Amino acid sequence: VIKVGTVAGPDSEVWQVVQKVAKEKEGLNVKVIEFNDYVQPNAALDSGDLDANSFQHQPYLDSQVKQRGYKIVSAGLTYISPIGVYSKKFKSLKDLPQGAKLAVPNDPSNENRALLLLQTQGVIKLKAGAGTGGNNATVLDIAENPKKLKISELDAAQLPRVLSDVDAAVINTNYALAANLQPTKDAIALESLTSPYANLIAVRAKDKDQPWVKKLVKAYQSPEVKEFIKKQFKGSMVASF
Ligand code: MET
């Protein structure tokens, strides 16, 4: 019995399809264990409670390894989902008022990612080398902030639920979709597909060469799953296979 941890929302939806493919094509018995946010699946994998997880990109895994020394590696890529900026109050970042309130994720890699997107969009400039080379930028690394934006750093999962009280927020696509935001229609700015944020299936290092691993990855990287991703998420998630 293969226990795969994932985050409730689009990932869990995809995994219902993968579960079916894994059984029919690979003879695997997959159980999908859902988590509400990003915090626990690596710890649960490290401890043996899971056999794999499928919720993160490589910069996130790298950050987690730096923090906890997890012996966890990628077994293969799943999809990429360009992060968007959302607003209930403005149609463009150019419309932000003086002293506008923004919210971004507060974990090292996604906070860095959000600040880079804001930099790309010309809203801010980070201090030299703050967000590159593996370094992660925070709001304290902002060198230029012409509009004197007030940037809150909040838990990634909470961001959709503060939209009424900020002028814009940078929100991970899994959470945006779960909150009925559509990245291809509602976002006022969007990250490029040429980013390092493809998501992945992670397993314990010691298990990386087990036969079930390649079989599981094959089940995910299947025509059925690609078709589901295309149809269900309308281009906000792009298969990485
Ligand atoms: C936990 S790292 C972020 C994962 C999320 N699915 C994203 O691609 O934005």
Side-chain angles (χ1 to χ4, degrees), residues 1-19 21-35 37-70 72-93 95-122 124 126 128-143 145-147 149 151-184 186-205 207-213 215-217 219-226 228-230 232-233 235-241:
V1 176
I2 306 174
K3 300 182 68 185
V4 180
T6 198
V7 171
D11 291 294
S12 59
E13 296 184 359
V14 172
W15 274 90
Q16 309 310 305
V17 183
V18 183
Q19 180 177 250
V21 175
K23 177 178 177 290
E24 300 182 356
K25 296 285 192 288
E26 310 293 340
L28 301 183
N29 190 1
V30 170
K31 298 300 177 177
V32 182
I33 307 309
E34 304 190 21
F35 294 83
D37 59 32
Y38 296 155
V39 178
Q40 296 303 327
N42 285 330
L45 176 56
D46 183 72
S47 71
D49 289 334
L50 301 169
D51 303 296
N53 66 43
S54 181
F55 78 105
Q56 77 200 303
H57 48 61
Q58 191 72 53
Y60 188 91
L61 180 52
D62 286 348
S63 175
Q64 298 256 296
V65 167
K66 179 188 286 292
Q67 293 169 353
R68 299 286 215 88
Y70 291 142
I72 289 169
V73 291
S74 179
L77 299 184
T78 52
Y79 64 87
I80 190 164
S81 58
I83 197 162
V85 182
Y86 301 86
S87 180
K88 294 296 176 193
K89 312 184 183 180
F90 300 103
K91 291 297 184 178
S92 173
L93 288 170
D95 294 321
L96 293 175
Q98 283 296 126
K101 283 185 53 182
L102 303 193
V104 299
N106 66 4
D107 62 283
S109 72
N110 290 292
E111 172 157 5
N112 182 67
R113 178 183 191 182
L115 292 180
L116 289 176
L117 178 59
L118 293 179
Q119 177 170 245
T120 293
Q121 296 298 318
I124 57 168
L126 298 173
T132 71
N135 293 347
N136 292 128
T138 72
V139 298
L140 297 178
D141 298 308
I142 298 169
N145 192 350
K147 282 186 180 175
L149 309 173
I151 305 180
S152 284
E153 303 149 295
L154 308 177
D155 291 350
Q158 304 298 340
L159 289 164
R161 294 183 293 287
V162 305
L163 273 176
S164 63
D165 286 28
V166 298
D167 300 310
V170 180
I171 308 182
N172 293 269
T173 288
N174 64 285
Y175 293 129
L177 288 170
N180 295 283
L181 302 164
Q182 169 53 232
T184 62
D186 297 322
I188 67 175
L190 203 68
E191 185 183 59
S192 183
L193 282 161
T194 60
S195 82
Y197 303 107
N199 283 212
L200 58 85
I201 295 170
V203 299
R204 289 181 299 276
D207 286 351
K208 70 188 179 65
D209 290 319
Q210 295 288 75
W212 63 263
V213 174
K215 298 176 68 62
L216 188 61
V217 171
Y220 196 110
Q221 299 182 343
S222 60
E224 288 93 340
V225 172
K226 171 179 286 193
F228 181 79
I229 292 174
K230 287 206 208 184
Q232 183 75 10
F233 309 111
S236 68
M237 290 161 55
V238 174
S240 303
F241 59 90

